[PDB]
Amino acid sequence: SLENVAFNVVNKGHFDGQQGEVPVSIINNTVYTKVDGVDVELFENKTTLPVNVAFELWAKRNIKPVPEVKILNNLGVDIAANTVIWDYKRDAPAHISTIGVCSMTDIAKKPTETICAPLTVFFDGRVDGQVDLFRNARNGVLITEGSVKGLQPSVGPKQASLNGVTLIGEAVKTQFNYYKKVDGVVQQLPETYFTQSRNLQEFKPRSQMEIDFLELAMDEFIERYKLEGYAFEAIVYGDFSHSQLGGLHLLIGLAKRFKESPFELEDFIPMDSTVKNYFITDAQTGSSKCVCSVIDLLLDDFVEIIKSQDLSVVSKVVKVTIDYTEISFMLWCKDGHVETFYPKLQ
Amino acid sequence: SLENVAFNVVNKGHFDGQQGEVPVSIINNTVYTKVDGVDVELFENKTTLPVNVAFELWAKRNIKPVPEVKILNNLGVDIAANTVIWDYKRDAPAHISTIGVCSMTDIAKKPTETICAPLTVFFDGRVDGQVDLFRNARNGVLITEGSVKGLQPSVGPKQASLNGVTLIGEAVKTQFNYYKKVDGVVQQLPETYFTQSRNLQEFKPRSQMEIDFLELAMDEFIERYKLEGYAFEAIVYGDFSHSQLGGLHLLIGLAKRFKESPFELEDFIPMDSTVKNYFITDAQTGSSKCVCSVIDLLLDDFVEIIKSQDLSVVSKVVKVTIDYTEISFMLWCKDGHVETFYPKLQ
Amino acid sequence: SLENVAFNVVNKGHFDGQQGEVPVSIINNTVYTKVDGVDVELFENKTTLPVNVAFELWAKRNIKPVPEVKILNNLGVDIAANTVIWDYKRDAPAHISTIGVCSMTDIAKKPTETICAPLTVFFDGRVDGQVDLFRNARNGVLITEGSVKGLQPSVGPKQASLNGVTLIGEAVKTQFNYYKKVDGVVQQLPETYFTQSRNLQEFKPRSQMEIDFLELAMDEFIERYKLEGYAFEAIVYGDFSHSQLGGLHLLIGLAKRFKESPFELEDFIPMDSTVKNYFITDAQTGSSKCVCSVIDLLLDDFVEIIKSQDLSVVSKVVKVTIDYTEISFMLWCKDGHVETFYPKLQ
Amino acid sequence: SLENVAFNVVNKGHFDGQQGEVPVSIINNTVYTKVDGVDVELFENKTTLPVNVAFELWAKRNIKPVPEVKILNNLGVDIAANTVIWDYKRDAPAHISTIGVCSMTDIAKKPTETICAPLTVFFDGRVDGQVDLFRNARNGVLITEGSVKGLQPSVGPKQASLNGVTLIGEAVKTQFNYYKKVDGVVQQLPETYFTQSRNLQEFKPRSQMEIDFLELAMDEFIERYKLEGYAFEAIVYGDFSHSQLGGLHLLIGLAKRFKESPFELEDFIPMDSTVKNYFITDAQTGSSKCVCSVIDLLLDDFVEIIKSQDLSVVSKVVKVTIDYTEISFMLWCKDGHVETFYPKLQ
Amino acid sequence: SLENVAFNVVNKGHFDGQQGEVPVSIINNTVYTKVDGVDVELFENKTTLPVNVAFELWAKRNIKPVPEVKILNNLGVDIAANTVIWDYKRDAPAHISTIGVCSMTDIAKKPTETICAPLTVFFDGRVDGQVDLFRNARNGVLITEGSVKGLQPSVGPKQASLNGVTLIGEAVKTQFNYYKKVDGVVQQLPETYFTQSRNLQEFKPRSQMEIDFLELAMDEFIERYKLEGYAFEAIVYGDFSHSQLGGLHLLIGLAKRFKESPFELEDFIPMDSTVKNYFITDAQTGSSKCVCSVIDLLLDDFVEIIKSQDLSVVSKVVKVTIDYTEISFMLWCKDGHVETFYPKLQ
RNA sequence: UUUUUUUUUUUUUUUUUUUUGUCAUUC
RNA sequence: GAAUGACAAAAAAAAAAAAAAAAAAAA
């Protein structure tokens, strides 16, 4: 019920399943409620779904630390089992349909129905009875805070999305063990690097090399870590000397530049992906680039990736398995030294 | 609840208080429900209220024969008790607020509260206990199918509004006795003429004089009923010889002209009123008048009214009580004969 | 392309696959085009789909005689192969998704992909290569103007929907042979009665008995066709003596009553179905029923059905296979004669 | 008029009363004006009112220092006399109706009519003649910058809302003497505590103890002010060790935690009230609470309140009059020391 | 095509002119695209144009450094040749019509047609063949990064707009030479002062005098630069001692105040102009002025302007040519010293 | 004969936030 | 000596539009 959902929202902040109703009015793609005789906005529809459907999905969203939407997308997850994963980047549900949550978007009441068999259903091991449901599922992805009997685990990212904030949990456990089944057989998830999912204005280093990068000059940092010949002066630090922006394909370099000279980042595809494309215009020098593919790789991980390559190639598209998906980097070695190494996804 | 209201609508045609819910989607001021997997339109909001509130009011509307909205308006009825009167002319509720119907439009749960005391509350005597409520109400209007103990009745119109169509009921009683209370004292309603509330395209005579007017010519009908000197050739039949239309202030004349030559009726104020203003454009002779007051008085009643006037006055405003309200007619006479008789102020 | 679709609409009336572009503006859920410098309406979106998507689907609708949407719904058709069946009752596409029509609603480009296997895909045999496509489909429904080798035909209704109106075509063939496959095995479709799909205001009898019903009185028609004891005075002709309407469960009786005393039909579920529920309000006698199941069976078929039942049962639910689905009728009999006969659950 | 209102807005920033018109276009709940041939947005309607009505109410809003909307709500104010109080928290007018401001919302032209008698009209003493209007009002609330003859004054909050900015006026007087009348008799307003209406990101201490709280550590501040046994470690400072957040019921503690580690405050009821509920999620530790009642009491006032309680009770509901309304706190004590002190029912 | 434009947007962030289409859905004045099965927002329409037309214009906007919209407006530019100048202040195109950009807003395909002759067409000398077009244009404005043969150049502002970022180009050239033609004759543009177009929260001094103003106090800065008798204590620094704000007509003074005490700027006309009007409300002292003309002149330029005036006049209107337009400065003097230099019509 | 897959192979067009040349303009 | 604009040179990859060929596919 719409009124019961709004009552749960106004009394607890989300749908907790309590009983009760409140006066609700829907107008201009917005859900208003009457508090003390005056309308108070509860939810403004930013989705393509009907306003009531989107409101009820938003109320019933998962308020527990859930895997980042990019991780679920890279794993091929098509739907979630008896839960709603809310994509706060899009302000919309991460999946078009649901299983036993919303009557309008329901394709089944339980994940065991035949309709959900071809789909890769996301199972949350922290919910009772979901591990056994995943065991019987033809296609599914399982996350557990611990070990599962009989299946080899895959350790996921240290960070998880808790009500829209990507954090490494201390009071809560945000590191999950990932399992995948395709056509009834358990797949072995490949060894992967994981993007840190940090912000430009809230960037914090997570390693000693990151601290050195943020605190040292370009030449000192390059000489200290023997990073000569890998074009770190352009790939990470950036080249703000031409009308077209040069490099800046790591978020650490973007944060370092933003510390000294604020710029603008036009995100023309506002979604959650491993590689993000930005329309960056440097406010200090005027350097701009229409497409600047940015990956939130750990600086140690990026150093290892770029040092594991073969430098005697004119040009090569390099496949790196990052965030459980194969990211395509365009290696641009010349004369035995790297000229450009940028992600090409999205 | 919205879903319960839609369930009642799709299973019974109106809100009958049955339990159960159906999937509901609200989009573009319209309520849709999923029948066999495809969205089916249930209600398109033509009102100024929120779509869900208007849907709840429309579903909970009175489907029993109810007095016409114009009759309630002329009686000063401001709100209805435990019911919704739907104005089908406006496709909107006849009153802004309700009592014990819709949580967003309710000002009180019962008409006995102090908020409804100054308001003129419409009490329906066919509902159990509403007569007793009307007795204790400071201001109110009561309709009953029969007599009320200790209260003198006022016989209302023979016609009533049954689910949007005006009819003189045969299988169901559509004649009510009107009682009004202002400031706690039972008022004596005046002896009024009643409009027939007919339409042009299905006009049906209700009297012998009406039939004769429909079948007989102008001069024959005027001579037969001794209607010479009352300007019936213009007031009722209408004048189409000039660019500006003349007379045509009775719906009988409009219907007679429509029978031989249809014209266009632009109702620029689509509401329910005793005197209706139309933008009449004659498609045959090109005669048009921007505003034309048309009143649906019975032809016998109009003849009695026009014969009860004093003809020895150049200009006189005639106050005739019609549909429980005073309708002012502007009368022009010359040489002892009527020249012009139309509802004044147009 | 939206502009190419609108170009096809303005130059051919539907998407004919021509090349060209026109200036198109979308505003207030409506598609406008600029003709001679002034915006001209092309399409008003009455669906729940996005305006451009709905416009593209409407332009690519099937303009050939297609089976009525009720027939496809009763056959369990979930999607159409390389075509769009437009439901003119709802002014919306008959199916949520399409196969190789519109990229926004497409789930596959061809009906034989793995995604379309669980779905019952409607194959049109009049299109080259679709019979073989239906032969390879796990679930599908095939209609053909002629015979298909190795498959037993199922003669469908004489009527078909051509651009939104039901007609028995003479210049074009509207009778199709129906073949259904569920889980890869051809099913033998049951012997069924077919609704004639007629309108109230444009009712045209299709048999001698229907003509006699329309012209003869109630008693003469009942005595001529030995229809005593089957309560034809109530089920078909209808009773308007009480405030609650009785009967009117056959559209021919509604047509006969409308021929004399027009009434109002409020379709609170505006969709195509074998059994239609209306909110009937008799404008002459005041009789009204909130819900009334009306089925448009041929009077010969209804007579055969009512004569094939056993009269010596107090209460019995009668199952009739109509329009390829089982319609459940309520049968009440007393003293070896019929009392009421209406579709059950109304 | 709408055009005159827009002229006043574009020439003076608010409706002053000047004569003149500017070209105006209304589209998508927004009012645009044509400045030098290009449309300029004047007002985006965030209310449930019509766009033009909301625009005219916003233009005619009070730009003088007005009482905070929560103060008016706690006093029972239902309408304002010849002025509009704009609620900047909701971006909507604080009251549904107005008195002599907007013709679409007006229930009266002057507050002396019968319709305004039951309502608690807000009279502003800084406008000439409003003191005498309040003296003759059945129900009303009066604010004055000075003393009123024959009336005992109640000193209000030091801060007041000035064009949506809460400030303690230095060049203007933001302290008003509050008077109240119900049924024609003056009440003596209770002696209440007043919330400071401070922001999280712009928190500024208003006393020495708040400075000590923000500067010194938890243990030092607790020991210095003899605050042992009142659970200040969790009640104000808060506990971030478990998955569910504990405490943070004083906005000063939220400000102190924000100063060291920013977190998200999801205000699911964006209105103005003495007690605010937030969906608190700690970005550093992962602690989160769905509903966290936060009140912006002066730290001196909160210390006095917590020291005025009787500690020898297991469970006790505390009635505290804050902002002219009774705020309920739930008190748990064990072994003669406080365990928690939070607003009741959250 | 809408789909091709959206494909270009999702691939490069702006319309580059490539071939390809993506699934696009338009709903609620917003353009969505389907990326990985979920709709992703691409553009939300804040203009008065249709959503598809506005999206096409936004994609085809100029991404190179272009003159500020205020400069073009003051030069009387009515339309741009084969380009779109996006006004990021209004989030709408700076000109109503276009030349060979979008079919819906196009008045001509080339600027040489007769329709574009009366309009002052903006020509970009950086684009090949536009200087020749400007030579043959009856009315036009041309900007070039260098000299033009046979034409005397007018050096423009040092700053220009790059993707909505106003910057002095270092990697790019943001200084242009302005040429204007009206009725086929080349005018000599006047010698003008230029507004710096700086932000309040991102104010950066561009001269030694501005640095001194920001660092020193009022008295020291006035003494060092010999600014006694010019009322710099009010015009620039501003007066907050009264309820009505005094002076503060230079953005440098607003920035200096914002450094120590942030306040509110209600820009009730959100457009780009040389003289901006703000509804300034001082949060610290409560001094507010409904309308306040703030001009972003260089402090040295303003000092020269105020020292070039004739002080021996009681009241005088001062004409200063700023940004190629005549700004009316209202000067008040008493006893041979400046009293107030507020910009006219605040 | 139809179909999806496993795809491979051939050609056309488009593209890639690499370097490099020619023409063009402007210092 | 540079910048910009219009293009080409190198290397790899992607997208489709045309096919052929195949292991499968059901006919």
Side-chain angles (χ1 to χ4, degrees), chain A residues 29 90 268 270 281 284-286, chain E residues 9 28 39 41 162-163 170-171:
Chain A
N29 231 357
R90 302 188 306 115
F268 48 93
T281 300
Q284 173 154 100
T285 64
Chain E
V9 162
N28 305 124
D39 279 305
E41 189 207 77
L162 173 58
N163 291 316
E170 291 168 25

Side-chain angles (χ1 to χ4, degrees), chain D residues 16 33 36 92 104 159 185 229-230 253 269-270 283 302 327:
Chain D
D16 186 307
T33 179
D36 287 76
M104 210 64 181
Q159 79 272 1
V185 289
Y230 295 109
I269 306 155
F302 176 79
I327 300 299

Side-chain angles (χ1 to χ4, degrees), chain C residues 51-333:
Chain C
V51 54
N52 60 299
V53 180
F55 176 56
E56 163 153 10
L57 289 179
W58 170 76
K60 300 179 177 182
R61 80 202 176 282
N62 207 291
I63 61 163
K64 295 192 296 158
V66 285
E68 318 97 271
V69 179
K70 63 178 159 248
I71 295 288
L72 303 180
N73 290 341
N74 297 340
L75 289 169
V77 166
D78 287 312
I79 201 165
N82 307 103
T83 204
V84 168
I85 306 299
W86 195 257
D87 198 341
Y88 290 82
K89 302 290 164 51
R90 306 186 305 115
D91 300 316
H95 313 114
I96 328 184
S97 300
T98 52
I99 293 171
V101 170
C102 176
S103 35
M104 251 305 298
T105 55
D106 264 13
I107 71 181
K109 284 272 161 263
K110 294 162 201 323
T112 71
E113 281 167 58
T114 66
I115 178 64
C116 315
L119 302 173
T120 301
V121 186
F122 169 66
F123 299 96
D124 188 17
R126 297 162 302 171
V127 186
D128 247 10
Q130 297 246 311
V131 175
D132 283 88
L133 275 185
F134 161 79
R135 275 186 182 114
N136 309 123
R138 264 224 318 139
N139 313 279
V141 170
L142 178 70
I143 64 152
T144 49
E145 276 170 351
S147 266
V148 154
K149 304 312 141 193
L151 291 201
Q152 73 304 330
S154 182
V155 201
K158 294 187 298 150
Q159 75 271 2
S161 176
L162 175 60
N163 283 317
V165 314
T166 296
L167 49 93
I168 301 182
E170 281 108 1
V172 64
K173 204 181 288 104
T174 57
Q175 190 145 39
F176 309 125
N177 296 330
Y178 288 77
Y179 313 87
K180 188 175 181 182
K181 283 178 66 186
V182 197
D183 280 310
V185 286
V186 169
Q187 313 284 100
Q188 211 263 329
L189 288 164
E191 282 265 20
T192 63
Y193 298 97
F194 290 113
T195 53
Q196 312 297 300
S197 319
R198 296 175 275 200
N199 294 306
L200 201 43
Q201 303 120 348
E202 333 168 30
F203 200 93
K204 315 223 70 57
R206 310 224 190 126
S207 98
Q208 175 62 257
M209 171 155 37
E210 296 195 338
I211 291 205
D212 294 337
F213 182 95
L214 286 186
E215 57 168 34
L216 271 43
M218 170 169 0
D219 263 353
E220 336 185 300
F221 172 90
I222 289 196
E223 299 290 90
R224 170 170 321 195
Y225 283 101
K226 61 195 28 184
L227 276 160
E228 322 92 9
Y230 295 106
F232 255 48
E233 46 272 9
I235 293 137
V236 194
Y237 283 92
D239 185 38
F240 308 91
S241 79
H242 315 277
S243 68
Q244 249 279 320
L245 204 142
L248 286 210
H249 304 292
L250 265 287
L251 194 73
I252 186 137
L254 274 85
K256 183 182 182 61
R257 172 71 176 184
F258 174 110
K259 284 202 161 23
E260 44 178 290
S261 273
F263 44 70
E264 227 205 304
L265 281 193
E266 196 196 282
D267 205 6
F268 50 93
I269 313 168
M271 83 170 305
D272 206 20
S273 288
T274 302
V275 164
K276 286 289 297 177
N277 288 335
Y278 298 103
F279 200 128
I280 296 172
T281 299
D282 198 20
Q284 172 83 30
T285 66
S287 277
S288 35
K289 189 168 24 172
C290 318
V291 82
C292 192
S293 293
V294 181
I295 185 168
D296 193 2
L297 280 169
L298 190 74
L299 197 62
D300 307 66
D301 297 327
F302 178 77
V303 160
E304 192 293 343
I305 290 167
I306 202 171
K307 276 175 191 353
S308 78
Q309 281 338 285
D310 173 56
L311 293 210
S312 82
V313 175
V314 199
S315 156
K316 144 150 102 152
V317 177
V318 158
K319 290 307 204 79
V320 200
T321 322
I322 307 176
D323 278 321
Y324 293 115
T325 198
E326 298 239 281
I327 303 300
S328 55
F329 284 84
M330 253 301 182
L331 173 75
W332 291 91
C333 300

Side-chain angles (χ1 to χ4, degrees), chain A residues 74-119:
Chain A
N74 297 341
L75 289 169
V77 166
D78 297 301
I79 201 164
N82 305 103
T83 199
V84 168
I85 308 299
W86 196 257
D87 199 340
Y88 293 81
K89 303 290 164 50
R90 302 188 306 115
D91 268 311
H95 312 113
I96 48 164
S97 302
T98 53
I99 292 171
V101 170
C102 168
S103 39
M104 266 312 269
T105 58
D106 250 1
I107 70 182
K109 283 272 211 63
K110 302 142 181 313
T112 66
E113 279 170 58
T114 48
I115 184 43
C116 315
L119 305 153

Side-chain angles (χ1 to χ4, degrees), chain A residues 29 46-48 73 90 93-96 240-243 264 266 268-271 277 279 281-288 290-291, chain E residues 9-14 25 27-28 32 34-42 58 61 63 162-165 167-172:
Chain A
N29 231 357
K46 288 284 164 12
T47 82
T48 57
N73 294 340
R90 302 188 306 115
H95 312 113
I96 48 164
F240 304 110
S241 78
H242 292 294
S243 324
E264 73 153 29
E266 181 191 306
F268 48 93
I269 309 138
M271 55 160 327
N277 279 6
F279 197 142
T281 300
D282 191 52
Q284 173 154 100
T285 64
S287 267
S288 35
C290 303
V291 185
Chain E
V9 162
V10 305
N11 273 28
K12 332 199 95 53
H14 73 117
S25 67
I27 175 186
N28 305 124
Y32 295 87
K34 191 161 288 273
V35 189
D36 196 325
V38 290
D39 279 305
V40 178
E41 189 207 77
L42 288 191
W58 169 78
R61 81 200 173 282
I63 56 133
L162 173 58
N163 291 316
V165 190
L167 50 96
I168 299 181
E170 291 168 25
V172 305

